[PDB]
Amino acid sequence: SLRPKLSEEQQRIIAILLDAHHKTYDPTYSDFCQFRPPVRVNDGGGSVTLELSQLSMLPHLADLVSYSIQKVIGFAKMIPGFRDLTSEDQIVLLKSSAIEVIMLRSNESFTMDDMSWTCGNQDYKYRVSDVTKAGHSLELIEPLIKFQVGLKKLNLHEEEHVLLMAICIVSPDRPGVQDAALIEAIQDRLSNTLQTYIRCRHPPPGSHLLYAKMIQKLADLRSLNEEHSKQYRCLSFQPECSMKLTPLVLEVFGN
Numbered sequence: 001s002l003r004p005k006l007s008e009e010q011q012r013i014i015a016i017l018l019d020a021h022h023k024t025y026d027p028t029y030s031d032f033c034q035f036r037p038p039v040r041v042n043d044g045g046g047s048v049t050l051e052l053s054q055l056s057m058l059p060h061l062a063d064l065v066s067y068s069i070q071k072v073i074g075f076a077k078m079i080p081g082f083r084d085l086t087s088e089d090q091i092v093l094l095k096s097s098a099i100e101v102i103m104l105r106s107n108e109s110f111t112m113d114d115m116s117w118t119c120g121n122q123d124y125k126y127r128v129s130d131v132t133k134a135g136h137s138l139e140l141i142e143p144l145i146k147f148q149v150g151l152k153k154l155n156l157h158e159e160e161h162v163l164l165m166a167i168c169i170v171s172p173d174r175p176g177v178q179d180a181a182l183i184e185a186i187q188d189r190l191s192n193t194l195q196t197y198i199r200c201r202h203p204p205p206g207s208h209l210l211y212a213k214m215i216q217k218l219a220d221l222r223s224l225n226e227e228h229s230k231q232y233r234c235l236s237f238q239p240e241c242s243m244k245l246t247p248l249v250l251e252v253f254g255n
């Protein structure tokens, strides 16, 4: 059961990704008061008609997602090797992974205390009912919550969390990529860093089959991505939806 030590290069990769995350994820959520304000209409019955008529939480959650895409673009640019890719492949990778990295990075605000993403006072505590007030349905939200709990229970080290986000972004099997072999080389360098880290720095029993569990979460994210895309397309049919979104969100998710 060999445990090769992390190379100097692998240690540098981990330090770079930790720094990149610390520069692009504010764990105080202090910018969120700058977004359009959250509004919660009375919708205890979960009425799709009402939810679509009002889309009360959409401006705020679209601003949150847009902000988060900006942060993910910045994080990606600091992944070792990402800037070796052509501009065209960088943009394909960013647009295809954005929602997945948002789901991953949001695990840091997710809490099993009450199954919410807690980003401050009540105003910035996001629950499943807030996501339905932004026009989404249970076929996305239920698996998303299940995903957040499963990821929580892996008890990832921050090193592993940031490696997982980087591996998600640098995926050679995204539609439209040109230099799949270069993307795969970059991804393999990150994957080998992660496997090596787990084996020499993650104590048992949480280390047991941990790499395989993390790779499974990447597959789960693909399913969530596809369901989000389907639901976004239907949300976009609502008259005046575009004004509730942002230009960046429209580009990343638009048809």
Ligand SMILES: C=C1/C(=C\C=C2/CCC[C@]3(C)[C@@H]([C@H](C)CCCC(C)(C)O)CC[C@@H]23)C[C@@H](O)C[C@@H]1O
Pocket (backbone or CB within 6 Å): 058, 061, 062, 064, 065, 068, 102, 103, 105, 106, 107, 108, 109, 110, 117, 119, 126, 131, 134, 136, 140, 228, 232, 249, 253
């Ligand atoms: C974003 C981040 C956070 C929460 C993410 C959540 C909670 C609200 C609902 C979200 C945003 C899900 C929604 C299904 C996304 C719908 C987007 C849209 C309306 C455009 O189709 C995905 C992840 C969710 C907060 C913080 O962790 C930063 C992070 O970065």
